[PDB]
Design a protein around this ligand. Structure first.
Ligand SMILES: Nc1ncnc2[nH]cnc12
Ligand SMILES: Nc1ncnc2[nH]cnc12
Ligand code: NA
Ligand code: NA
Lengths: 178, 178
């Protein structure tokens, strides 16, 4: 697993000074285009939970889709998307989350989660944790249980991990950077 | 394959009168949340091309990600995302496409496609075909060859299939509706 983990971390490029300057951007597209690194990352995420009793996987659009939906397929469970507003067509509920310069909302299908569901949330990267906190609340409001959230990349210094802890989420990340 | 196809088509819900009225919306989320239908759809898309010589799969965000990236994983090839502008961090090129009330642009990483690539484009649904035509041009401008585009759902009466034909794309769809 250490060999695999190392190969995954190495497959991720760092783009210095993007968008703003000083910032080191961690770019997962270089992983997506490496078939061994991409399948390794899905294999490790799905192995880690292979008998956690997961009944649903939730991913937040769009980059969450890229890791959430394959994990679901590998676990053999339904995938449920959380989207920006006006994209889901059936009955939704909604949660808002403060961004840096404003607020945004996320929605989920009310039918896609029911009491008893054990839900794994998967996203590409954990930064501040705001979308994931809104996601969690969406799932909990439909009676769904979420204890774990999984990420390819954790950036701990941006505080999302700490933040999710306060909400009672176990965060699992394949790799991390500062 | 007919049993499988039937089960996939049935798993897709139709929402009458969404967004506007009269329109019958074909909602793939009901398929995503059905583990048998979702894995069946990926199995059939990837089987169909299992010795077409594909070296890359391209999907356009966000709903294209949901079918493109698992097909890539199943074929064992790199996934390459096409995104709205300002999301990809490395060097991109760009293509514009007329929408109903305006124009939008799509971008791709210039490094992710090279001469010799045989590229499959996968999306959830083919309607008018405008995003897929822009996608194709992006891939062809980097020296990449695309002959096939695959979809879960074809809505032929909206003319995208006809439109892609004129650009020399073989469209393969699992199902279709009017
Ligand atoms: N350094 C970083 N790389 C990728 N995504 C981020 N989101 C916030 N900071 C980031
Ligand atoms: N009827 C329909 N269902 C889903 N997506 C569409 N895009 C255009 N028409 C559509
Ligand atoms: Na419910
Ligand atoms: Na190139």
């Amino acid at each position: 697993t250490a060999q695999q983990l190392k190969y995954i971390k190495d497959s991720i490029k760092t783009i210095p000074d993007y968008p703003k300057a000083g910032i080191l951007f961690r770019d997962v597209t270089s992983l997506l285009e490496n078939p061994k690194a991409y399948s390794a990352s899905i294999e490790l995420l799905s192995e880690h939970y292979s008998e956690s009793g997961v009944t649903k996987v939730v991913g937040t659009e769009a980059r969450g889709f890229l890791f959430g939906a394959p994990v679901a397929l590998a676990l053999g469970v339904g995938f449920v998307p959380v989207r920006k507003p006006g994209k889901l067509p059936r009955e939704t509920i909604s949660e808002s989350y403060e961004l840096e310069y404003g607020t945004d909302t996320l929605e989920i299908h009310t039918d896609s989660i029911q009491p008893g569901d054990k839900v794994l949330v998967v996203d590409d990267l954990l930064a501040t944790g705001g979308t994931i906190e809104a996601t969690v609340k969406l799932i909990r409001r439909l009676g769904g249980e979420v204890v774990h959230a999984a990420f390819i990349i954790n950036l701990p210094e941006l505080g999302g991990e700490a933040r999710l802890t306060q909400q009672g989420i176990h965060c699992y990340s394949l790799v991390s950077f500062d």
